[PDB]
C-alpha cells in the first residue's frame, strides 16, 4: 500500500532503504517484500516531514544506519516479521527506544549514575 512517486530523491531513498533491508538475509528468512516496506516507510517519513529538507534526509539516514547495524539485528527481524508496524518505525524517537537492549541498559545505568553525579548541596 505504498503510493509510488516520480521524485528522484524519494525513490532513491526507497531503494537505499531496501538495500538496508537486504542485509543479513532476514528478508529471505521472513519472506516479506522489503521494497514495499521501504516504500511504505519513506511515504510515512514524507507525510511526517512534508518536505525533502534536512529533517527528511537525516531522518532517513538515521533510520538506515539503525537498520544496517549488526549489533541490533532483532530490530530488523521484528521490522521484517511485522512485529514492529511500519508507521511506528517511521516515527521512532532516535536511539531512546529503537535500539538494542544492552544499549538501553547502559543508558539507564548512566541515567541513574547522573543522579549521584548531580544532586549535592552537601
Amino acid at each position: 500500500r505504498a503510493p509510488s512517486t516520480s521524485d528522484s530523491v524519494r525513490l532513491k531513498c526507497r531503494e537505499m532503504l531496501a538495500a538496508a533491508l537486504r542485509t543479513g538475509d532476514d528478508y529471505i528468512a521472513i519472506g516479506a517484500d522489503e521494497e514495499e516496506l521501504g516504500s511504505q516507510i519513506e511515504e510515512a517519513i514524507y507525510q511526517e516531514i512534508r518536505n525533502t529538507d534536512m529533517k527528511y534526509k537525516n531522518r532517513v539516514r538515521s533510520r538506515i544506519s539503525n537498520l544496517k547495524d549488526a549489533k541490533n539485528p532483532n530490530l530488523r527481524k521484528n521490522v521484517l516479521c511485522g512485529n514492529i508496524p511500519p508507521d511506528l518505525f517511521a516515527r521512532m524517537t532516535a536511539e531512546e527506544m529503537a535500539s538494542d537492549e544492552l544499549k538501553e541498559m547502559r543508558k539507564n545505568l548512566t541515567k541513574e549514575a547522573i543522579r549521584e553525579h548531580q544532586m549535592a548541596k552537601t
Binding site: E116, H117, Q118, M119, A120, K121, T122
Partner: protein, 96 residues
C-alpha cells in the same frame, strides 16, 4: 587510591578538603562538648560564660581541650613552599 567520588558542584579536591574540614570540625565540637560537661559548678569560666558577661563556650573548649583548625581566608594553611606548609613536612602532606 582514587576511590573518593566528588560531591556534585564540587571538584575532587574540594570534596576531599570538605570531608577533612567536617571531620575536624565535628572532632573539635565533640571535644568541646565533653570538656563543657566536665566543668564543675564552681568552675569560674563556666560562671562567666553562663552569665554571658564575658567569653563564650568556644573559648572554654579552646583553652581546655583543643584550639582547633587554623584557617586563612577561610581555607586551611596553603603550601607557601613547594607543596609544603613548612620545611618540617614531606611534600604533598594533607594531614591535619
Amino acid at each position: 587510591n582514587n576511590e573518593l567520588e566528588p560531591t556534585p558542584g564540587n571538584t575532587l579536591r574540594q570534596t576531599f578538603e570538605n570531608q577533612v574540614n567536617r571531620i575536624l570540625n565535628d572532632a573539635r565540637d565533640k571535644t568541646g562538648s565533653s570538656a563543657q560537661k566536665s566543668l564543675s559548678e564552681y568552675n569560674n569560666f563556666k560562671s562567666m560564660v553562663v552569665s554571658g558577661a564575658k567569653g563564650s563556650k568556644i573559648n572554654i573548649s579552646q583553652v581546655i581541650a583543643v584550639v582547633g583548625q587554623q584557617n586563612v581566608e577561610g581555607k586551611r594553611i596553603p603550601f607557601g613552599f613547594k607543596h609544603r606548609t613548612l620545611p618540617h613536612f614531606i611534600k604533598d602532606d594533607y594531614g591535619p
